[PDB]
Design a protein around this ligand. Structure first.
Ligand SMILES: CCCCCCCC/C=C\CCCCCCCC(=O)O
Ligand SMILES: CCCCCCCCCCCCCCCC(=O)O
Ligand SMILES: OC[C@H]1O[C@@H](O)[C@H](O)[C@@H](O)[C@H]1O
Length: 466
């Protein structure tokens, strides 16, 4: 199983998940500083990313790991609140700039291509206080942050992810309120956040395109979380239609405007508009794009960035009682197959990635695809000789090879989540996604390879499978 010559083999991190130094060198607080510091059992064991992997202090150790793997690409994020303590360029933290420039220069020294995420679930607290993604102000704030990053780092960085998993963010932060700012707004806040996230991304694309592309010659997208979805009863038409609609709701809601025509999917507009009217709203809970907005949003991604972990079965569930929520809007329920293995929400369904890649190819005009996250967690106690987890990886790489060979999908980069065991949001350190083990009790935060690391290094070196 030889992969294409020049295939990208990568690993990913995120600033809040690995950096620590949450208040080092004049860094401003982000929403995760505030949220984890509040405690109240919203995070496993009231854990924080105050130190995490200590990557702000221990970049040289991360680089060792990257070199050991022989990665061709390394994905990481820029901390907005580290670079710009108040969110704006009124005050620039030079030690922040120096830090990321050291990552970039080191990677390039070593032939490793950076894939850089501007914003990864971690708003500066100041900007959240001014409304976050629920308010229009955020669009210009984000656009200006993006231009600052393009300006500062774009002479060396050519592959950008503006926003990590805008779909997960919308839902977790603003609808369910499981992420900061932590207030539930079922059926309402998610759609408002999504609307501003889409606009902000499109604006940053146009800024790149107008101001930076000619000289810098890079490409810009945003990453979208994708769960592959199958009908619960494969013969049921309503289930078949419900699985399709569930894909449309969680993935195409974002990807259609940006890649296709600047507007939401029609089934999304019609389902939400209908429930909204029955609920006594004078306007749909899904904000509309203006005609000018549709034109600005359409075609604002240079490649398709997808993050795949798992699959679910979908059953149609009529919203008889007119209940308020995204699931109720889509009129679906989801659940695993009893046969599937899992750690946390990650049910091991490798063929899901093949189905997804074919879907993306069919739906989004055969685009260039980067898988900017894929991986598997272990629970404590996590064995260093993680032979069962490596087997999940092996099967996943077989599905990628099939998608390339059989389905002719233009998959160019695969990025493993994660380089390091890290702070897995609400799960804290209890979910270990790393190729490298990290001891969080040890003040030196030593990195030690899992078996997966050794095995991944072989895949990369051979550019393919046994
Ligand atoms: C990780 C598995 C996620 C599967 C979701 C796929 C279905 C897509 C439809 C939109 C659902 C959005 C809400 C998801 C979280 C709701 C869980 C809950 O009831 O608290
Ligand atoms: C508001 C936009 C509507 C689109 C719905 C997007 C749904 C995204 C997928 C469900 C959330 C999964 C959360 C990530 C994993 C986890 O933390 O459990
Ligand atoms: O949504 C699934 C994943 O999303 C990533 O963006 C995040 O960095 C991971 O820790 C995990 O939450």
């Amino acid at each position: 199983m030889a992969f294409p010559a020049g295939f990208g083999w990568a690993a990913a991190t995120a600033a809040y998940q690995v950096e620590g130094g949450w208040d080092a060198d004049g860094k401003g607080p982000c929403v995760w500083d505030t949220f984890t510091h509040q405690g109240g059992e919203r995070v496993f064991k009231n854990q924080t990313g105050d130190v995490a992997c200590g990557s702000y202090t221990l970049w040289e150790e991360d680089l060792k790991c990257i070199k050991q793997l022989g990665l061709t690409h390394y994905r990481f994020s820029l901390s907005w609140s580290r670079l710009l303590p108040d969110g704006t360029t009124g005050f620039i933290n030079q030690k922040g700039i120096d830090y990321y420039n050291k990552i970039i220069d080191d990677l390039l020294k070593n032939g490793v291509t950076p894939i850089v995420t501007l914003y990864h679930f971690d708003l500066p607290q100041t900007l959240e206080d001014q409304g976050g993604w629920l308010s229009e102000a955020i669009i210009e704030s984000f656009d200006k942050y993006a231009q600052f990053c393009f300006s500062t780092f774009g002479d060396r960085v050519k592959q950008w992810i503006t926003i990590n998993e805008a779909n997960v963010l919308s839902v977790m932060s603003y609808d369910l309120g499981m992420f900061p700012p932590g207030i539930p707004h079922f059926g309402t806040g998610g759609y408002q956040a999504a609307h501003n996230l889409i606009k902000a991304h499109a604006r940053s694309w146009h800024s790149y395109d107008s101001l930076f592309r000619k000289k810098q010659k890079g490409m810009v997208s945003l990453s979208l979380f994708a769960v592959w979805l199958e009908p619960a009863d494969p013969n049921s038409v309503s289930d078949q239609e419900a699985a399709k609609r569930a894909i449309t709701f969680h993935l195409d809601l974002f990807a259609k405007p940006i890649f296709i025509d600047g507007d939401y999917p029609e089934v999304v507009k019609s389902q939400i508009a209908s429930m909204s009217q029955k609920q006594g709203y004078p306007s749909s809970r899904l904000p509309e794009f203006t005609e000018e907005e549709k034109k600005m949003i359409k075609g604002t991604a240079d490649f398709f960035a997808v993050q795949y972990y798992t699959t679910r079965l979908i059953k149609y569930q009529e919203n008889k009682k007119g209940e308020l929520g995204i699931l109720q809007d889509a009129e679906i329920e989801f659940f695993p197959d009893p046969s599937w293995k899992n750690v946390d929400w990650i049910y091991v369904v490798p063929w899901g990635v093949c189905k997804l890649l074919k879907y993306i190819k069919d739906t989004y005009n055969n685009p260039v695809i980067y898988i900017t996250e894929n991986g598997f967690p272990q629970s404590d106690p996590a064995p260093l000789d993680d032979t069962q987890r490596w087997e999940y990886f092996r099967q996943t790489f077989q599905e990628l090879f099939k998608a390339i060979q059989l389905d002719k999908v233009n998959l160019q980069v695969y990025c493993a989540w994660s380089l390091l065991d890290n702070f897995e949001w609400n799960q804290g350190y209890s979910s270990r996604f790393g190729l490298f083990h990290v001891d969080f009790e040890d003040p030196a935060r030593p990195r030690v390879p899992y078996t997966s690391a050794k095995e991944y290094a072989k895949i990369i070196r051979n550019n393919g499978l046994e």
